[PDB]
Amino acid sequence: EPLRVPPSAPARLVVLASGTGSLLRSLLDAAVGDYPARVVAVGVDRECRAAEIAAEASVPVFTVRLADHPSRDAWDVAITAATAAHEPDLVVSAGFMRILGPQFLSRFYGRTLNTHPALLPAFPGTHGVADALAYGVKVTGATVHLVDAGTDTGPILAQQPVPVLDGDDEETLHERIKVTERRLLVAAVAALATHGVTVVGRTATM
């Protein structure tokens, strides 16, 4: 039946990343004072700006490279162990570019989240903003959701709409979506720490 993830405040948070680190930056700025989590480590699979931002904020960085393990299954086993060594309560995938495998999700399903710049299940994939623009919707949005076995498929945690303006291009639309995407992620992490989450079918309530 249901999956219950208990409250965890003050939460130990692990961010997984491969890219720019801007969501990472958004989470480091917010996790101060009474914010009910702290970033305890950043995991990357390659040298990247996110690793740099993490080190500059005195956050431990662990690296697990696909090229150092004999296959995808063994990499899944190793990322899982390197992440567990930090005992997180929550894992944010923030620009991470590897699919999290069966072993990782066996351990961290319910506690792992991702953000997407459309109102899932509309516009999944890497071109969510450009697609929403080509499709001619007037309303798009940002989604935070639990990571499951598929990509963009997990139980939804929080959503907020964002208008498409006349004459918007991709860039101007994307930046508008990113403003909301950042707040939504920050609020979702706090809420999961404070209240935990229950999942019935595919529906996630705090």
Ligand X SMILES: CN1c2c(O)nc(N)nc2NC[C@@H]1CNc1ccc(C(=O)N[C@@H](CCC(=O)O)C(=O)O)cc1
3-state secondary structure 75-128: HHHHHHHHHHCCCCCEEEECCCCCCCCHHHHHHHCCCEEEEECCCCCCCCCCCH
Catalytic residue flag (residue 127): no
* E strands, the chain, in order: 3-5, 11-17, 37-44, 61-63, 90-93, 112-116, 139-146, 156-163, 197-200, 203-205
Minimum CB separation of residue 99 from Cl ion in Å reads 30
Looking at the chain, the residues that come just before a C–N gap of over 2.5 A are: none
From the list 10, 12, 19, 206, which residue makes contact with ligand X (rule: CB under 6 A)? 19
Residue 34 binds ligand X, judged by CB under 6 A: no
**Using CA atoms, how far apart are residues 164 and 132, in angstroms rounded to an integer?**
9
* Token pair listed for 19: 């890219």
Residue 126 binds a second copy, judged by CB under 8 A: yes
From the list 63, 151, 159, 172, which residue makes contact with ligand X (rule: CB under 6 A)? 151
Q: Would you say 31 or 91 has its CB closer to ligand X?
A: 91
Q: What does the buried/exposed string (b/e) look like for 69-98 if buried means 16 or more CB atoms within 10 Å of the residue's CB?
A: eeeeeebbbbbbeebeebebbbbbbbbbeb
Part of the chain binding a second copy (CB under 8 A), chosen from 24-32, 48-56, 170-178, 192-200:
192-200
Residue 25 binds a second copy, judged by CB under 8 A: no
Site string for a second copy, 148-177 (x = CB under 8 A): --xx--------------------------
Part of the chain binding ligand X (CB under 6 A), chosen from 40-48, 88-96, 134-142, 165-173:
88-96
Part of the chain binding Mg ion (CB under 5 A), chosen from 16-24, 74-82, 114-122, 197-205:
114-122
Minimum CB separation of residue 35 from Mg ion in Å reads 21
> Which stretches of the chain bind Cl ion, using CB under 5 A?
139, 161, 163
> Which stretches of the chain bind a second copy, using CB under 8 A?
4-9, 46, 65-67, 70-72, 84-85, 87, 97-99, 106-107, 110, 125-127, 150-151, 194-196
**Active-site annotation, residues:** 116
